[PDB]
């Protein structure tokens, strides 16, 4: 919210969000992402609003992850960093699978 989620636990690079490349930064209580060329994060979602998460497997020209919210919305993250995109996808996934259920509550 606005206390511990101001610290970045996971730093991700070259991540495209909505046809725009940038850097992703996962915080204690929220997932944030800053677009390249900008000084501010245009992506700020609380793990409490995230229902689930998808990870796009190999076979695609890119590695991806997506924040599926219970709000009926989905935040897709295109990992364009060839260097660690796969592992990055995995770490974002891991940390979220770690973090998400600790802040959210099933709709059932």
């Amino acid at each position: 919210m606005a206390t511990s989620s101001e610290e970045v636990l996971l730093i991700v690079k070259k991540v495209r969000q909505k046809k725009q490349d940038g850097a992703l930064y996962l915080m204690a209580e929220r997932i944030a992402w800053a677009p390249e060329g900008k000084d501010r994060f245009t992506i700020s979602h609380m793990y409490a609003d995230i229902k689930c998460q998808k990870i796009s497997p190999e076979g695609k020209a890119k590695i991806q992850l997506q924040l599926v919210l219970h709000a009926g919305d989905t935040t897709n993250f295109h990992f364009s960093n060839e260097s660690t995109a796969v592992k990055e996808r995995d770490a974002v996934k891991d940390l979220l699978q770690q973090l998400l259920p600790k802040f959210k509550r099933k709709a059932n």
Partner: peptide, 19 residues
Amino acid sequence: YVGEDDEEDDDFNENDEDD
């Protein structure tokens, strides 16, 4: 595509399940 147009987002595998 319609709605999501980042590029290709279909083989997207879930993992958190139906929360």
